[PDB]
Amino acid sequence: PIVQNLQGQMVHQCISPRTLNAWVKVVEEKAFSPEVIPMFSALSCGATPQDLNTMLNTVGGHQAAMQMLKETIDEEAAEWDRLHPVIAPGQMREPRGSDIAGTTSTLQEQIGWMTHNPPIPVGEIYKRWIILGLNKIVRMYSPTSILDIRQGPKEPFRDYVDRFYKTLRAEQASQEVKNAATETLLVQNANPDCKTILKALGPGATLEEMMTACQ
Amino acid sequence: PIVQNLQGQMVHQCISPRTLNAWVKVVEEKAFSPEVIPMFSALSCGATPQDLNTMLNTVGGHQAAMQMLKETIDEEAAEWDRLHPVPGQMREPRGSDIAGTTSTLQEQIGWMTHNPPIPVGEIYKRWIILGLNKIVRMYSPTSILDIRQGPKEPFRDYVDRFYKTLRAEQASQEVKNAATETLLVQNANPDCKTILKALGPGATLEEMMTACQ
Amino acid sequence: PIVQNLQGQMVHQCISPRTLNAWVKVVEEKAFSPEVIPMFSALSCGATPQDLNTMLNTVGGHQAAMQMLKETIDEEAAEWDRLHPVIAPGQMREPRGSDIAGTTSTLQEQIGWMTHNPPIPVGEIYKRWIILGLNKIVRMYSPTSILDIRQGPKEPFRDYVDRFYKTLRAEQASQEVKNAATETLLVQNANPDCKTILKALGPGATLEEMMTACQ
Amino acid sequence: PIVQNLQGQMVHQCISPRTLNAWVKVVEEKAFSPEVIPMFSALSCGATPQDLNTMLNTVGGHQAAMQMLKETIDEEAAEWDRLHPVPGQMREPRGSDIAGTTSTLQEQIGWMTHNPPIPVGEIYKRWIILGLNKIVRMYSPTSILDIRQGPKEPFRDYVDRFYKTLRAEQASQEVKNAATETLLVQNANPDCKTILKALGPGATLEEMMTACQ
Amino acid sequence: PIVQNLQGQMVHQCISPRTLNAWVKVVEEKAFSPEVIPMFSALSCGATPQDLNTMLNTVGGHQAAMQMLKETIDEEAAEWDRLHPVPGQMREPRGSDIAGTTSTLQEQIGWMTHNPPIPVGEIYKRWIILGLNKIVRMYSPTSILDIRQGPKEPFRDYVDRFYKTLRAEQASQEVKNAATETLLVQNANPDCKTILKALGPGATLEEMMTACQ
Amino acid sequence: PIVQNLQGQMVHQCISPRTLNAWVKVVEEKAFSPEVIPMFSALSCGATPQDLNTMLNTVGGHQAAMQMLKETIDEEAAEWDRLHPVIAPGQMREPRGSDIAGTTSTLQEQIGWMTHNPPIPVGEIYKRWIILGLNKIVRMYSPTSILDIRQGPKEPFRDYVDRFYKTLRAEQASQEVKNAATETLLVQNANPDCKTILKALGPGATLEEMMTACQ
Ligand SMILES: [Cl-]
Ligand SMILES: [Cl-]
Ligand SMILES: [Cl-]
Ligand SMILES: [Cl-]
Ligand SMILES: [Cl-]
Ligand SMILES: [Cl-]
Ligand SMILES: [Cl-]
Ligand SMILES: [Cl-]
Ligand SMILES: [Cl-]
Ligand SMILES: [Cl-]
Ligand SMILES: [Cl-]
Ligand SMILES: [Cl-]
Ligand SMILES: [Cl-]
Ligand SMILES: [Cl-]
Ligand SMILES: [Cl-]
Ligand SMILES: [Cl-]
Ligand SMILES: [Cl-]
Ligand SMILES: [Cl-]
Ligand SMILES: [Cl-]
Ligand SMILES: [Cl-]
Ligand SMILES: [Cl-]
Ligand SMILES: [Cl-]
Ligand SMILES: [Cl-]
Ligand SMILES: [Cl-]
Ligand SMILES: [Cl-]
Ligand SMILES: [Cl-]
Ligand SMILES: [Cl-]
Ligand SMILES: [Cl-]
Ligand SMILES: [Cl-]
Ligand SMILES: [Cl-]
Ligand SMILES: [Cl-]
Ligand SMILES: [Cl-]
Ligand SMILES: [Cl-]
Ligand SMILES: [Cl-]
Ligand SMILES: [Cl-]
Ligand SMILES: [Cl-]
16 A cells, blocks of 8 residues: 655555455455445555555455456446546656556556655545446345345344345445335335334334334 | 554554454444444544444444434534535535545545644544444343342342443433432342341442342 | 653554453453453553543443442542642643543543643543452452362362462452461361471471472 | 665565465465465565565475476576676676575665665566466366356356356456357356347346346 | 664553463463463563563462462562662662562663663563472472383383473473483383483484484 | 664564464474474564574473474584684673573673674574574474375375475475485386376476376
């Protein structure tokens, strides 16, 4: 990554063994459960494109996912090139999409862009592309559709709501989209005894109020 | 977070793998037992709003709780906006800026390291902990009225259950100290209750626990 | 905690994940065995009152103990207020007992007292109160009285002495008090075959000499 | 390794216990699965040739692989020597100097921190990774031609096996993207193959995986 | 401990959780096996007397041993006092000051960082290690005279037991090297003893172990 | 160890708990398998003689080995004394063999030699002696001779080669010595079906070529 030294300059630092292992382990244990994405983002704080490729490439298995991600990255890189078409001796060159993705750029080139004044934040740009690709994989690999999340006849309302919002989260539902699904489905698919209670609360009931009423 | 480096300057630092994993593991093992809140607060020492959202978002499962929390945050942001309406100069934070959803990391650092600081990390953390406390209370399984000492239950074990329940119900510290002379005695088993009655008013918890040992 | 930076000033530092987990784990594993107190003291090196409350509050369970500790702290805070009764714009205010205990003072107020010249060491004062309370809990929760520690007919003298001084330690026995109990009980409650041997050594026998003689 | 300290200077640092153990554990658990190579590269960030030899030498077992690697290193050193023939002044590195067997740590630091640097650590690492890639390929157990979707095998699981095998066989990224329209369809089971045929040319992998879900 | 910071100054640092846990775990797993002493010494690198008492006091159990240690410390403190009788100026340490029971941390730092230093941490550690060595010897279960090679016991295994026992009995290094020609042969089984006799005097341990392999 | 500070001076640093435990654990788990030596060397980076003795002395068990190592060290120290026979107030004294081995020298004496201009690298000299002794122990404790490594009738050629070069490594075989053993034994002791294949490749076949041909 790039970190700040004591002088106040942004300098390169090796990716740590703890960072490397943490990312490998979370994929091993959680695959593409939705909470892996914020973990990838946090573990890749300050990452160069090289560091981002290191993290992706240290994943063994899930190679269908990793190949889909490459295809998403190539699409995003192709769009970058469409909007930013691109040498003076000793001067900074403009990055291509594949430079941002770390496959045609050197580490020192990446550092130069990231620490430039103003910076070309190739690490942040690449990370956005990766997360776009990971979000498609999370959505693709969700085992449940929200329409099939119905409360069981003896299922605690709390457990049903957990499934409902887990499923919705895997869908990358906006707050707009998440609120539409709740309004359309949450009460309507609660079990009969809980459903009558929630209707009395009205459309303005908070989730907290609904969960208290059906406990 | 924003921490002071070894030279005296306040600088941004990445959240560490250790911090990230500690928070995930605490929720996995303890869910929303009350002691998870002080752990969240300490693990988020110096957090920017971005760091706080990272910690919340790295939790898998418990999405009913996480959605209630989001709703609490939105209420607090709306109250912030009600009290604080809004080249190269610094903008005032709205509620969604404090909550990290409409503000950038560099903007959050700008507010936090401003002179004087706008401590958006601390403000957001207060909102989050307000929401976590409501979750703790909702997921508290027992009322203090149903914690009664079993006929052969050691008084120490009963007192442990009583004050565990009280903490999850989030009785004030005053009610915790006051229940020592009222409800704690009333729900003791007959043999110990007779002993506690003889102690008279004003017995400390230590004195009650010694007397029913 | 408060640590020294490279300039030589005492500055605040976040409590570490390793510190936080170490304290939680030792209570989980050892409860109020006597050696937990020196571990609490060492893990709270340089702690602010806020850090001390964090450590106590991260304990789940043992809430009888934690409530007894609160009562001890309130007593000590009440005595502080009795001896130190207590605003100029921009100036340091004198701490109340509840300020030392971290419930009515801010972190920046605590730092100001701790780093003042001369310091008001509110962290050290509060820690003393906590350890006073923990010592009462260790003593209360000891399963054995020293009068019931007698050497078994086939028990190795070493194992008996281990039980004897474990029990005495839980009692918070002074060195004065610890020596009186040894003189009163250790030989007198050794088993007959070992007891005759130790009497011959006389009252000046070291423990080492007694343990060698009864092996 | 050679890293920049908190003041801006490039200095030698001991390889850490954490780095040492991570590398040993990765080989123990994964042997020469392809993802071990990027892990070796990152764990050897900033390595001197001495550090690289330390990491290789701390591996127990797999000595057939380690001997093949030594032979690959010797070939690369010979090609280096073919292209680069050789008081108080700095000497030029031979292949065995780059590989750390005839050069001292202080000489390696001298080359790496020279202006301009002779990056013997990076050169040696390239040779090593060339040798590790040959080991990965040799120890690849299956040909891509034998990865065929089972009649009830989920298409996702088959695609995982297909691209795992392709990676171990070290098909180029072009061949990986090209096989999506050719071999991946051909080795699908009849039911999914009919679906993929109807998709027409140009289907992305995501589109194929959705279609056979 | 007192350590030098990254700038060159000797400063106090808190004992770390890692150090604290390592010491507790070593005693839990190994009790007073002889190799625990060098581990205690290294883990207490730079320790103040306060740190040394922390490490000793964090041990649970083994209180017979800990009481013997206290008695040894008191003897050493008394000998110190016998040899060293005692506004804003520095006071001389008594034995109980060196042992950390009557001195404050700031006083201990004052002595240790004085010019010239009064190294109370090192002095106390010597006393402690003197006491730990006596505990190691007392808890040594076997005499070297009872370590004899079994009729089918590999000579290497017998030599391991012999020198483990010798270390716990704390034979000098001279006696360890001298026993190679005397007791080690005498307690070997008949078949190996005949071989060792033929080797003649002056055989190294390596030569004896090869000969009885 | 001795590490560089920010000024650029070589200063003493305490050996770390992680270093201490790593060395103890690798001996517990691996004994004197050949790869333990490079681990000892790496874990003792920058070590003083005191640190080297700490590492050796924290090993419990294997005391036959540890005593052999002492004998090797004493031999090397005796040779040092033979080549370097050895006080001015406040001046550096020349180290004896036992000073290099850390038994007659203080830590501050060792630091003075190691950080002198020019340095007397007593830590590096001692480490060489220790590794010489450990190499003799690795060789002594190898369970197999290379002459007994023959390929099984159903054993994969890869597994046979692994055993062959493991055994050779434990022998401390040079590259010269290692190549002579391969030329003498590797094909000659391959099983019949694999042996005919390798002979056709000729004496210039790489190992890679031999392993491909017999898979
Ligand atoms: Cl690390
Ligand atoms: Cl994210
Ligand atoms: Cl790769
Ligand atoms: Cl690169
Ligand atoms: Cl840009
Ligand atoms: Cl609920
Ligand atoms: Cl970390
Ligand atoms: Cl809190
Ligand atoms: Cl998220
Ligand atoms: Cl953000
Ligand atoms: Cl404000
Ligand atoms: Cl009790
Ligand atoms: Cl930590
Ligand atoms: Cl204490
Ligand atoms: Cl709390
Ligand atoms: Cl506070
Ligand atoms: Cl005061
Ligand atoms: Cl004994
Ligand atoms: Cl480390
Ligand atoms: Cl790579
Ligand atoms: Cl090696
Ligand atoms: Cl070297
Ligand atoms: Cl070059
Ligand atoms: Cl799919
Ligand atoms: Cl630590
Ligand atoms: Cl020692
Ligand atoms: Cl204690
Ligand atoms: Cl003290
Ligand atoms: Cl002195
Ligand atoms: Cl042997
Ligand atoms: Cl450490
Ligand atoms: Cl080596
Ligand atoms: Cl020792
Ligand atoms: Cl020493
Ligand atoms: Cl020399
Ligand atoms: Cl093969």
